[PDB]
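Work package 3, deliverable 3.1, input record:
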Amino acid sequence: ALDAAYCFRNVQDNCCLRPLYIDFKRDLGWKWIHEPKGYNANFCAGACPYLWSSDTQHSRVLSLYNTINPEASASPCCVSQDLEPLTILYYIGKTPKIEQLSNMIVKSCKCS
Amino acid sequence: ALDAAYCFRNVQDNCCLRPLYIDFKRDLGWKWIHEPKGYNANFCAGACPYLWSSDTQHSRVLSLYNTINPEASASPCCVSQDLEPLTILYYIGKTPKIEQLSNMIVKSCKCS
Amino acid sequence: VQLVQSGAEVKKPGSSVKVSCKASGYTFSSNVISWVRQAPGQGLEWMGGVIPIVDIANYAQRFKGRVTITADESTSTTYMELSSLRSEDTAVYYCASTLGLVLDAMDYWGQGTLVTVSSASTKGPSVFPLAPCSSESTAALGCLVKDYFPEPVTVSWNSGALTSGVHTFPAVLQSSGLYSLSSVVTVPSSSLGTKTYTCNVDHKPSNTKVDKRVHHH
Amino acid sequence: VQLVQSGAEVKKPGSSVKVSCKASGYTFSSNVISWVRQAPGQGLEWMGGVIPIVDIANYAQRFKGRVTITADESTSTTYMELSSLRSEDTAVYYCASTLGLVLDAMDYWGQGTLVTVSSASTKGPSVFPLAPCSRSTSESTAALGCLVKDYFPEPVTVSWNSGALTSGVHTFPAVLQSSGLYSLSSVVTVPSSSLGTKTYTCNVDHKPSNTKVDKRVHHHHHH
Amino acid sequence: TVLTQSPGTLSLSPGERATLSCRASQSLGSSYLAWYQQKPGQAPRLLIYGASSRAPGIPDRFSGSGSGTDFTLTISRLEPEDFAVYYCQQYADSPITFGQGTRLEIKRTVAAPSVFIFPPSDEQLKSGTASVVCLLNNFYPREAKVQWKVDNALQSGNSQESVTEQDSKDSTYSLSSTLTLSKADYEKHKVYACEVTHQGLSSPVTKSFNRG
Amino acid sequence: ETVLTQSPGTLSLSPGERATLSCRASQSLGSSYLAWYQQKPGQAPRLLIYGASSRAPGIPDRFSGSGSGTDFTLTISRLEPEDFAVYYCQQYADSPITFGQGTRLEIKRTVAAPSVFIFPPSDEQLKSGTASVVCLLNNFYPREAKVQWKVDNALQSGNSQESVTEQDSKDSTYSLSSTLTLSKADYEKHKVYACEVTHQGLSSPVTKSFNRG
């Protein structure tokens, strides 16, 4: 599993969960939001070598094709597998509003 | 949709469905299939700019984060959306065998 | 930053209208769009708004029930849909970008979208003279531009050579659902019988061009 | 390119055996792996094969229902599992890769794996020296050896001087004795001049009983 | 929240100072009020936000102040381009509410209207409709009343009035009132009159015509 | 299932000669569905020919195959002494894959008489209560050899096991070990232990004995 447990505790140049903090006002220009001020979104990055955390038959086949013919640029990509929501607080005038935004945090990765 | 209809009829440097015909013997070294000799596997490649065919909220947010801070290497990645099976024929001696291999062909793309 | 709205629309009563508003790219990613309406010769009415990147909409209580504000991720466009249209929904609809918060001051505005609610079809005007019957130094003449649809009509006197004393009135919507307009001109009585007065009327929607010479009763 | 198989095994009847086969390199992703057995009785028999990545296994009728052939592409290893073992399943099991098709000629083979199917108990060998009388040593060439007695099951590995001595060596095929235990002799012919000058040691390894014996063979009898 | 703007109309000359008021039905704090300028046929223009902050690019002559329930917009050295409608907006409590507006017109001396009555044309009567038109020309202030009388019977619900924007040259207004009848009905009557009431008229003026 | 019949079962020829091995199939195999293997002692089969006539990668030119339908042939044109092995044919025309019973190929060399050696049991073994007397016949040809055990001239039977090595790929000879097994009790009752060897390469039988004195 390409999760925090493995990825953050070990050095990896192939597809792995990478840490990333997003500050709303700084990084996105979202001035409408009260709380939190940012979050640990994380991202998926790294090489997709032959059979490394392959999602579907197509990714298995391409990891192989791209081992043989790298020139074609047809490699599978390092992407999100498991995601988590992020609870936000924002105001409509004096009115506080609690919203759940789904699939905001990436928890695990895969090669697709 | 990032399918054949759009992608093959238009020039795009951004995430799009790319044509790819994989030859069994030449490209993968699979000498066991009788028919077909290869197949239009296709692949997904290209840039994932702000709000271009975003999969999840995370993909939307990171398309934005990566517009602001490209240096972080946190860009969403061009990946498979709709997958289709491939029907093959192989022989066990004189016995013909028909197999549907699932998720062999990519029909559309997404930025994840 | 520029907000570009969809063109003017004519809708039958009981119908529904979807008004679009395209934004200058990254003002969708960070901004909030508000929708405000202004009925003819009235003040401003806030309808609601949306946070485009997350598609969260908020409405004014008198507008939930007939309004839907949506965001199109791709096209960088916000949509506002008003249903069960009545004559009182004839207005100019504006989208505006807020200063930052959900409820805030609005700095960038779209050009506006006129939504006219009428059962009427395109009709060219009937141009009638306006002349008195009865000593005075100044006399008035005019022409009545009646039963047309939709707005606008252009009115000039003597192909533009006559501008002084001219008053073209704002159009009024009649009980029939057709517009009516009057254009007048005040002239020295000495001119009457010596000078010619033609009112030039143009209604591009019906391809009507009328030249009406005005006499006396 | 090389196929390396797991070591020899002893299995009680009715039991099951899992034999592994590791492939050196990036050839696992492309070849059909076949399993063939060879018993003195029935001779060479094809069991079945597996196509990798797509993971299609195909079996010979006489084995369908008892065999499972699996491919762990991560370790580049193929496994063969044969269940409901009977005495007739005692054989050398080979994995081989085919030339291309599911049923084809096989170019690369593993070293083989001996599977013994018996209810009998594992016993380590007794290693004894074989030295002449010093009376009969009246020639230019002498023979020495060691006797690997009363072990079960097969096989035993026999080397002389840790492999440094290969010339003149004859390790005899094991014979099954009246007791139901195997016996083997390994001999070496040497120049008589060597006797008493050179050290001769036969190294015996019986993995099933975890026996490792190093036996010094003295140049003549009673030692 | 209700925002009450005062006055409804403010009459001044270029170079003068305008003081517009917004009174709120409940406290808005000090950062939740904005001012807008709207010129004819255009979108509102943000002038002030958060009671006192000038919006980007807004001239220095525009200034705002206030807290709680009382807010003020001050326009100094009035330019002719400033003669428009001004609205206040609150964003302290949902829903956003606006004030009724304050019109900023050019001041001038009281001018009584020149009244004119027009009988319907025979061309129109052929169509089956009769539009009788009453014109009130070049008057100041904008407030004027028009009553239609057909054979002394006071008419209501059968007329539409329209007013011009303030004249750029003379600073006056003009008004047209159109009484609409059917040919059938028009023919049943003799005297058509429009009675005009305005500040510059000592007593109401009537302009009539008989169907002779 | 297809049955492959190989003939002859055994064949011994001299270096330089030509070997012709036959595979006869119970049903037609076409012409591309037969392979030949060489199997040396203690080793896995080695692919020689595939598709009835194609030499496998790196195979010497002296190996050749031919045939179609039901009759196939493997030919070794200029036998080398290293050519000793068991040769198998394999069909892959019809499921399941089937093999032939094998053909053992022996490579003739000049008659070589065995060097005989006798080994008394070690005292280490005698302590355990058993006595194994070993007779070794080394580097002989042909394979046929007789060994008689004599204890004080009394001919022994039913108390010995022989073991023969496979033909040595280098010198083309055989070696044989014969093991006479007695109990310590019985071994001690006797004096002279001898093994009499008979072989074509010996003018008359040779005896190697040891006396416990």
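The two ends of chain C are 57 Å apart (CA to CA).
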